[PDB]
Ligand binder design. Structure first.
Ligand SMILES: *[C@@H]1O[C@H](CO)[C@@H](O)[C@H](O)[C@H]1NC(C)=O
Lengths: 50, 49, 49
């Protein structure tokens, strides 16, 4: 007998980017200066996701 | 067995072409370079922190 | 005017070269990856408002 069966394999997912200064802070300008004291956390995060 | 000379010559010519294509600075070893680069950027971030 | 520069100190300790990180997109791309020579490709640099 001849039988045709199926196999389902994932290949990829959804690509995502985030803006740190809009997620953490928003439109504020005191938050931006207070967040500058933590080094490059957001350059690091943008590299990881990219 | 009847075409041994042509096969030996094709083998030798392909070996010389592998050598000449590696000499001419074409980057086909970008994966080991990527390994080196990722380790160095990790340590630069840790020291800059 | 208040700008950001990336200054280059040489072996003897003197400033030999600099880029202005506000002149072009290319000077910003130079300052963000911290080099003077960039390879080919696409690179994210900053965000716009
Ligand atoms: C550093 O100074 C010495 C003596 O002034 C000079 O001979 C040498 O070329 C200088 N190095 C560079 C990179 O200019």
């Amino acid at each position: 007998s001849i039988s045709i069966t199926t196999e389902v394999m994932p290949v990829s997912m959804a690509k995502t980017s985030v803006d740190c200064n809009m997620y953490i802070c928003g439109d504020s300008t005191e938050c931006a200066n207070l967040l500058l004291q933590y080094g490059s956390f957001c350059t690091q995060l943008n590299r990881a996701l990219s | 067995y009847e075409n041994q000379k042509q096969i030996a010559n094709q083998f030798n010519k392909a070996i010389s072409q592998i050598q000449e294509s590696l000499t001419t600075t074409s980057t086909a070893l970008g994966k080991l370079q990527d390994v080196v680069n990722q380790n160095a950027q990790a340590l630069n971030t840790l020291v800059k922190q | 005017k208040p700008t950001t520069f990336m200054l280059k100190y040489d072996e003897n300790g003197t400033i030999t070269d600099a880029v202005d990180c506000s002149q072009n997109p290319l000077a910003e791309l130079k300052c963000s990856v911290k080099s003077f020579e960039i390879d080919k490709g696409i690179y994210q640099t900053s965000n716009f408002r």
